[PDB]
Design a binder for this molecule. Structure first.
Ligand SMILES: NCC[C@H](C(=O)Nc1ccc2[nH]nc(NC(=O)c3ccccc3)c2c1)c1cccc(Cl)c1
Ligand SMILES: [Cl-]
Length: 347
């Protein structure tokens, strides 16, 4: 028996359709599972609305981290400006049957579900621009000095539509987030969206979220992850195919440089030597975003040829923004305020 029969063997609450909690919430059903717990849909009798309840796993390490999440959600939800409306709203939280429960405003499907719905053809450049703009505005809000919040797990599954037929989005899952100067983990971010500084074991700041955004925006237009590594070695090799070897000044300070690269007597770096015969990656920097995006050939896979809103000029602007978001140097990587001034967003 776990938690007196209330929990399964993975620390999760065994959800039961129709259950009424605290003479207030009427559980409709389980609507998602993840590493930190479950999200159920529930009707709130007192406020008379549908809400999403995240039931955190009944396990100390999960509980203690989720408490950092709550503090951050409360700090974001109360901070004064209107940019705060890109962040999901925590309505309240309580303990129930030894689980921490967070009650959220109801939202629709995530950006991954949207892509799946197009059969991974990708969404239009116009829709991509709308998501990009909203996300940069969310990132500008997190960068406001009082908050200085690093999300740490930006990816299509954590950006949700408010309404399934409309373009407005919100960011969820601050379960791994921290504030600048309160960093506690080293292996963070989903692998495909993971930044080079984290791969390399280096100190990291808010710039890691802009790296993830760049990866996300390409994926949303092409339908396909930009850097789809099966593990860390493979993830760094895939980044290198597109962007080249990272600059000497970063690798010279990187504790995990030698997991992926080796230093030559001249002071320059290469990828680590591999078995004779064993070709697997394109040579450094020869997989061009120019071709992935199909800038001059009708978009990703030619699928946008002779469509409105997908001109060569449009694509050149989009490509420039993306490369500025995928700068290897977290100190010169484009910051949210300047990204919003990019010609890609001109009216
Ligand atoms: N890294 C995944 C973060 C998600 C997540 O979707 N969290 C949400 C937070 C707040 C929220 N408010 N409304 C939501 N809507 C849905 O979950 C949903 C599901 C299916 C179809 C429409 C909407 C959601 C979802 C998640 C999913 C499953 C379990 C957890 Cl513990 C977290
Ligand atoms: Cl969440």
């Amino acid at each position: 028996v776990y938690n007196d029969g209330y929990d399964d063997d993975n620390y999760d609450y065994i959800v039961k359709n129709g259950e009424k909690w605290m003479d207030r919430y009427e559980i409709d059903s389980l609507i998602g599972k993840g590493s930190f717990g479950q999200v159920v849909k529930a009707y709130d009798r007192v406020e008379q609305e549908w809400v999403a309840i995240k039931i955190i796993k009944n396990k100390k390490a999960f509980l203690n981290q989720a408490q950092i999440e709550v503090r951050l959600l409360e700090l974001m939800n109360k901070h004064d400006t209107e940019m705060k409306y890109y962040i999901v709203h925590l309505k309240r939280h309580f303990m129930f049957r030894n689980h921490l429960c967070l009650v959220f405003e109801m939202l629709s499907y995530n950006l991954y579900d949207l892509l799946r719905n197009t059969n991974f053809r990708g969404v239009s450049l116009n829709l991509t621009r709308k998501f990009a703009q909203q996300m940069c505005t969310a990132l500008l809000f997190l960068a406001t000095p009082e908050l200085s919040i690093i999300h740490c797990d930006l990816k299509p599954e954590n950006i949700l539509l408010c309404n399934p037929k409309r373009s407005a989005i919100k960011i969820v899952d601050f379960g791994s987030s921290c504030q600048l100067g309160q960093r506690i983990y080293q292996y963070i971010q989903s692998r495909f969206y993971r930044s080079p500084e984290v791969l390399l074991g280096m100190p990291y700041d808010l710039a890691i979220d802009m790296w993830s955004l760049g990866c996300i925006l390409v994926e949303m237009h092409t339908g396909e992850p930009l850097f789809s590594g099966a593990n860390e070695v493979d993830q760094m090799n895939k980044i290198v195919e597109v962007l080249g070897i990272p600059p000497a000044h970063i690798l010279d300070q990187a504790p995990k440089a030698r997991k992926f690269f080796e230093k030559l007597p001249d002071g320059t770096w290469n990828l680590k030597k591999t078995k004779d015969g064993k070709r697997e990656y394109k040579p450094p920097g020869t997989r061009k975003l120019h071709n992935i995006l199909g800038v001059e050939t009708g978009g990703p896979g030619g699928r946008r040829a002779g469509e409105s809103g997908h001109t060569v000029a449009d694509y050149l602007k989009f490509k420039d923004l993306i490369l500025r978001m995928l700068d290897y140097d977290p100190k010169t990587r484009i910051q949210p305020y300047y990204a919003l001034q990019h010609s890609f967003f001109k009216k």
